[PDB]
From Swiss-Prot, chain C:
The RNAP catalytic core consists of 2 alpha, 1 beta, 1 beta' and 1 omega subunit. When a sigma factor is associated with the core the holoenzyme is formed, which can initiate transcription. This is DNA-directed RNA polymerase subunit beta'. Belongs to the RNA polymerase beta' chain family. Zn(2+) 2 binds at residues 53, 60, 63. The lineage of its organism: Bacteria, Pseudomonadati, Pseudomonadota, Gammaproteobacteria, Thiotrichales. DNA-dependent RNA polymerase catalyzes the transcription of DNA into RNA using the four ribonucleoside triphosphates as substrates.
From Swiss-Prot, chain D:
It comes from Francisella tularensis subsp. holarctica (strain LVS). The gene is rpoZ. Belongs to the RNA polymerase subunit omega family. Gene3D superfamilies: 3.90.940.10. This is DNA-directed RNA polymerase subunit omega. It catalyses: RNA(n) + a ribonucleoside 5'-triphosphate = RNA(n+1) + diphosphate.
Swiss-Prot record, chain E:
The gene is rpoB. This is DNA-directed RNA polymerase subunit beta. It comes from Francisella tularensis subsp. holarctica (strain LVS). DNA-dependent RNA polymerase catalyzes the transcription of DNA into RNA using the four ribonucleoside triphosphates as substrates. The RNAP catalytic core consists of 2 alpha, 1 beta, 1 beta' and 1 omega subunit. When a sigma factor is associated with the core the holoenzyme is formed, which can initiate transcription. Belongs to the RNA polymerase beta chain family.
UniProtKB/Swiss-Prot annotation, chain I:
This is DNA-directed RNA polymerase subunit beta'. Signal peptide: none annotated. DNA-dependent RNA polymerase catalyzes the transcription of DNA into RNA using the four ribonucleoside triphosphates as substrates. It comes from the Bacteria. The chain holds residues 490 to 587 of 1417 of the full protein. The RNAP catalytic core consists of 2 alpha, 1 beta, 1 beta' and 1 omega subunit. When a sigma factor is associated with the core the holoenzyme is formed, which can initiate transcription. Belongs to the RNA polymerase beta' chain family. It comes from Francisella tularensis subsp. holarctica (strain LVS).
Length: 105, 53, 97, 72, 104, 105, 223, 230, 98
């Protein structure tokens, strides 16, 4: 009866300014977020070209990737509303010139 | 005003103990124990890192 | 008995098994007098229930007894019906089986 | 409950209902008498409680109170 | 399991409990009976207080019945429903029940 | 996110122009030259976001209203404003102003 | 029968941690001085901090410049964590910042005008992915904490102004312990601050405040 | 630079024999608690004075609390009566000795009895007990002086019922905090003290004496002189 | 309560914990078996920090008590109490027995 409420409640939780990882998790938060289109998973493996808080550029080494276009883009979404009037904005992680792989954040 | 450990750090929240036993959501206690542990392990690394980087 | 009939007035008198009367008719009980019932060994008396009042479309201030909420004889104007109604089904949210 | 309570007043008048009506009549009387000259109601209490105080201190003797309605 | 938590607590340099000694902040004299402490992740729920206050003095009224609106979206007006009538009855509170049904 | 709209009523077209009597240039100060708030103004609890007006008629005003019109030479305006104001108890700032015009014109 | 304490800065250590001491006390009064020091040291000491900022090509907090890995609100949060030291009688002034680099804009790049001080020299303010211009100001002001309620919203005048809330009091931890020496005790107070004040000055200031507040009970008059 | 406020309002009020209620007004937030703790503790446990410590009745011929004596009061009652005597010593002397050596005929007993030593001043006329004119009796009281609360380890060690030491005239502090407002800022404090003493000193001046102790314990670190000016 | 004469404002959850806690006893504690004249004495003592609050002491009391029949007889003497319970002696109004 108590875990029922503990589960029904943590989905009305309101996000805040600076996200802080839990210190006692269950290794499942790695899965939910990745498995919902709020993150930006790199399609092809390469190196960061130029990143700023509006878009990301990735040049792909075609040697170890299938036929590609040598450059792809990802456009960030700053302060887009959502049905409950909560702010949505993605923030980049990577730095200039980093080795990333297909299926990373 | 909050209670504070001997070191000097104060405590943020003051929950109530009478809740837990009656409505048997024990797991919260064990979560607090593990959390204390993690917070100790943090201060350890900090001490080792406040010198000789 | 000394708890079932606390604060309810007495229909008629009560005679000792030794002969002398003990409590008269129309004598509202009270935790002083309710010693005098288990004292002398009594186990049955006649009290004034609202089932046996005689007033039309109402209730007299004696066939009902003590207010049981202010410890006095019921003042005239207390809508007793509503009180008794909601003091029955209210705890019902708890009695389950 | 600043100073006076129903437990006090219930000693002179009775049934705790008659109290309501009698105090209401008295407070209405004290109100319509133009007591509202406005240099007093900001230093003391509303007449609704002045009447209760008056009945507690046993000054008015509500047997008298009704005799102020014929004074209407 | 428990003993793992406990070995970790030891590594950290804490009692083999959660419990520890605390001091009041208004005096400094400690509490007896060492108290539990910990981290205990916490959340805030979407039931803020800014959108539940809603008082009202006088506002619009219902077209077909001439009664106040309801919901704090327009201007509300708190439902003084049926069960609250029996309450004011049992009290014998005639007046406050009367003008609760006409003047208001 | 609020939104105001302008319809064609049977007395005429209503207007969102920043021109409404009985309104100073102070409550209007945070208004641009087009009837719409700036992008950045920290609006308050009850200021104008877009200022509108709608016409009316059928005064046949009371004798006392007539007199007081006749003292201060108070003219009776045929229009009434129905602007858009933040409801009380709120605050904040502005981040985007979408405006959709008319068709076939 | 006469003991009176003197104050000593024994046992410095760590980043900005210290252990101040008062050598002789009255054998019983120690645990009063300890608590008073702690509480007044945690509530009233005033410092200086940034309260209002204006960035160059910005209009509000939820915005974004070009070639900046950061955001505007992330920048405003960075700014709050700068440790500023002001001199005796400044009480208000202006800071400036204009740069044309292509790396990490640390707080050391504030203009080295008079009076001011910037202790937290490592703290990043923003990261410029590419070379570009960047400029802003920030009004530094003295102040003390008062609670989340009795704080005035710090009026804004210009267009791009952006209020920044300010945590003034420079104390982070206090804890005391009392040691017995025979008809006498010694008080041993831990203090940890951001580095914007010196410990001895700090404790002296706190005791000044405290005795100032006590000095009414010597009179039992109004003032 | 906003000039931490000052009380600016006092309402002294006496309500019993050696008892008074002071109330202070408009103190900055939380200050009330610190100023209450300091005041209460130092006024209670760090004031100089003299007080009785030990009682010997019949030179040791009363061992426990269950021994009849030729008067109306059991031993416990006499101990409790004598423990209350308000004595003022002298600076030159460092110990007193109250002697209630009595053999009369069923009399009333008070402080105006009891041949003493030099330097004492019984300060009152508290009643003790009622003689029964029976067999002989004696009472020996020991009086010392100092500061602090000296706890007695054992109750009756050898031949004297030992007590613990008060060493103060102030017998009660019991302070409290309430709320008060000075306008737009309403989170402030309002303190109320309730002191009850023994008679050796009127309450208020005892309060002042305890405040002077603190304000005197910093002269080498603060300027207690200029704080007076204002 | 209108349903039954039982009161309805009794302390409930941890107002009860504290009372039950400070009103227990302990066998070997500090200051055990001491002597005190009145409540203020026990207060002064306990704030000094020598006694354990669960100790057994002896207090001499004297106060009126109301009888059933409207009498009010005096009660006095020495009673073996606990340091905790005496701390509650102040709140009990004159009229109820200790
Ligand atoms: Zn009947």
């Amino acid at each position: 009866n108590r875990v029922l409420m503990g589960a029904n409640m943590q989905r009305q939780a309101v996000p805040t300014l600076k996200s802080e990882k839990p210190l006692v998790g269950t290794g499942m938060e790695k899965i939910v977020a990745r498995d919902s289109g709020n993150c930006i998973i790199a399609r092809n493996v390469g190196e960061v070209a130029e990143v700023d808080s509006n878009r990301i550029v990735i040049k792909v080494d075609t040697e170890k990737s299938q036929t590609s276009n040598l450059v792809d883009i990802y456009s960030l979404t700053k302060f887009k509303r959502s049905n409950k009037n909560t702010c949505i904005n993605q923030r980049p992680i990577v730095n200039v010139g980093d080795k990333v792989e297909a299926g990373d954040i | 005003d909050m209670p504070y450990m001997e070191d000097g750090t104060p405590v943020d929240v003051c929950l109530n103990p009478l809740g837990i036993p009656s409505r048997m959501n024990i797991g919260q206690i064990l979560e607090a124990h593990l959390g204390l542990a993690s917070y100790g392990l943090g201060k350890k690394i900090e001490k080792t890192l406040e010198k000789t980087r | 008995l000394v708890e079932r009939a606390l604060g309810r007035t007495l229909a008629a008198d009560v005679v000792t098994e030794k002969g002398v009367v003990l409590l008269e008719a129309g004598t509202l009980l009270d935790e002083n007098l309710v010693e005098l019932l288990d004292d002398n060994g009594i186990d049955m008396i006649k009290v004034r229930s609202p089932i046996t009042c005689k007033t039309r479309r109402g209730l007299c201030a004696k066939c009902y007894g003590r207010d049981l909420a202010r410890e006095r004889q019921v003042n005239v104007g207390e809508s007793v019906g509503v009180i008794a109604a909601q003091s029955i089904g209210e705890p019902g949210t708890q009695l389950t089986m | 409950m600043a100073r006076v309570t129903v437990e006090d007043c219930l000693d002179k008048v009775e049934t705790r209902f008659d109290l309501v009506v009698l105090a209401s009549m008295r407070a209405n009387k004290i109100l319509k008498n133009g007591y509202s000259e406005s240099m007093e109601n900001e230093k003391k209490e509303k007449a609704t409680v002045v009447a209760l105080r008056e009945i507690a201190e046993s000054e008015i003797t509500s047997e008298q109170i009704l005799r102020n309605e014929i004074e209407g | 399991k428990e003993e793992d938590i406990k070995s970790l607590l030891k590594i950290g340099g804490f009692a083999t409990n959660g419990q520890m000694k605390l001091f009041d902040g208004r005096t400094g004299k400690p509490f007896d009976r060492h108290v539990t402490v910990g981290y205990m992740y916490m959340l805030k729920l979407d039931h803020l207080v800014d959108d539940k206050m809603h008082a009202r003095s006088t506002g619009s009224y219902s077209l077909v019945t001439q009664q106040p609106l309801g919901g704090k979206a327009q201007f509300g007006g708190q439902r003084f429903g049926e069960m609250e009538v029996w309450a004011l009855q049992a009290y014998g509170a005639a007046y406050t029940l009367r003008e609760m049904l006409t003047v208001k | 996110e609020f939104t105001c709209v302008a319809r064609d009523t049977k007395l005429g077209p209503e207007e969102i122009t920043a021109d409404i009597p009985n309104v100073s240039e102070s409550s209007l100060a945070k208004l641009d030259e087009s009837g719409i708030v700036h992008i950045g103004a920290n609006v308050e609890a009850g200021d104008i976001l877009v200022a509108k007006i709608t016409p009316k008629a059928e005064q046949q005003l009371t004798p006392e209203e007539r007199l007081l019109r006749a003292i201060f030479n108070e003219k009776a305006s045929n229009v009434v404003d129905s602007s858009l104001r933040m409801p009380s108890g709120t605050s904040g700032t502005v981040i985007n102003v979408q405006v959709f015009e008319n068709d076939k014109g | 029968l006469e003991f009176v304490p003197n104050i000593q800065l024994k046992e410095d250590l760590g980043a900005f941690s210290y252990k101040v001491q008062l050598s002789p006390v009255e054998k019983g009064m120690a645990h009063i001085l300890g608590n008073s020091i702690r509480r007044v040291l945690l509530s009233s000491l005033s410092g200086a901090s940034i309260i209002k900022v204006n960035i160059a090509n910005v209009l509000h907090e939820y915005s974004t410049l070009e070639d900046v890995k950061e955001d505007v609100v992330e920048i405003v949060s960075n700014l709050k964590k700068v440790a500023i030291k002001l001199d005796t009688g400044i009480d208000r002034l202006d800071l400036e910042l204009s740069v044309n680099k292509s790396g990490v804009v640390s707080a050391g790049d504030f203009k080295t005008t008079q009076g001011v001080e910037i202790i937290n020299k490592d703290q990043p303010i923003a990261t410029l992915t590419n070379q570009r211009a960047f400029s802003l100001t920030a009004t530094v002001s003295v102040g003390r904490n008062v609670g989340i309620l009795s704080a005035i919203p710090t009026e804004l005048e210009r267009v791009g102004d952006i209020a920044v809330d300010a945590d003034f009091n420079p104390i982070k931890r206090v804890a005391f312990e009392v040691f017995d020496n025979g008809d006498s005790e010694t008080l041993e107070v831990f203090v940890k601050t951001n580095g914007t004040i010196e410990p001895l000055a700090a404790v002296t200031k706190a005791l000044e405040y405290f005795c100032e507040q006590i000095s009414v009970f010597v009179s039992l008059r109004v003032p | 630079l906003e000039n931490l406020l000052h009380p600016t309002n006092i309402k002294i009020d006496e309500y019993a024999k050696n008892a008074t209620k002071f109330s202070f007004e408009a103190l900055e937030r939380g200050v009330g608690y610190t100023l209450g703790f300091a005041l209460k503790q130092t006024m209670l446990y760090s004031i100089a004075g003299a007080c009785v410590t030990s009682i010997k009745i019949n030179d040791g011929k009363v061992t426990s609390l269950e021994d009849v004596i030729p008067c109306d009061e059991t031993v416990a009652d006499i101990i409790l009566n004598v423990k209350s005597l308000s004595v003022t010593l002298a600076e030159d002397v460092e110990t007193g000795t109250i002697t209630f050596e009595l053999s009369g005929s069923e009399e009333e007993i008070f402080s105006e009895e009891a041949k003493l030593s030099e330097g004492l001043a019984i300060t009152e006329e508290v009643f003790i007990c009622s003689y029964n004119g029976g067999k002989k009796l004696k009472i020996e009281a020991k009086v010392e002086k100092g500061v602090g609360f000296r706890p007695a380890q054992d109750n009756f060690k050898d031949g004297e019922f030992l007590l613990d030491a008060t060493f103060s005239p102030v017998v009660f502090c019991d302070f409290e905090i309430k709320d008060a407002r000075v306008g737009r800022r309403t989170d402030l404090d309002k303190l109320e003290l309730n002191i009850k003493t023994n008679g050796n000193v009127n309450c208020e001046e005892a309060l002042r004496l305890a405040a002077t102790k603190i304000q005197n314990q910093l002269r080498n670190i603060v300027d207690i002189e200029e704080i007076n000016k204002g | 309560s209108p349903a039954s004469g039982q009161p309805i404002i009794t302390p409930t959850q941890d107002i009860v914990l504290g009372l039950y806690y400070i009103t227990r006893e302990k066998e070997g504690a500090r200051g055990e078996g001491k002597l005190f004249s009145s409540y203020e004495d026990v207060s002064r003592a306990y704030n000094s920090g020598t006694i354990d609050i669960h100790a057994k002491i002896k207090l001499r009391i004297d106060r009126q008590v109301f009888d059933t029949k409207g009498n009010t007889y005096n009660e006095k003497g020495v009673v073996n109490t606990t340091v905790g319970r005496a701390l509650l002696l102040n709140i009990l109004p004159e009229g109820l027995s200790f």
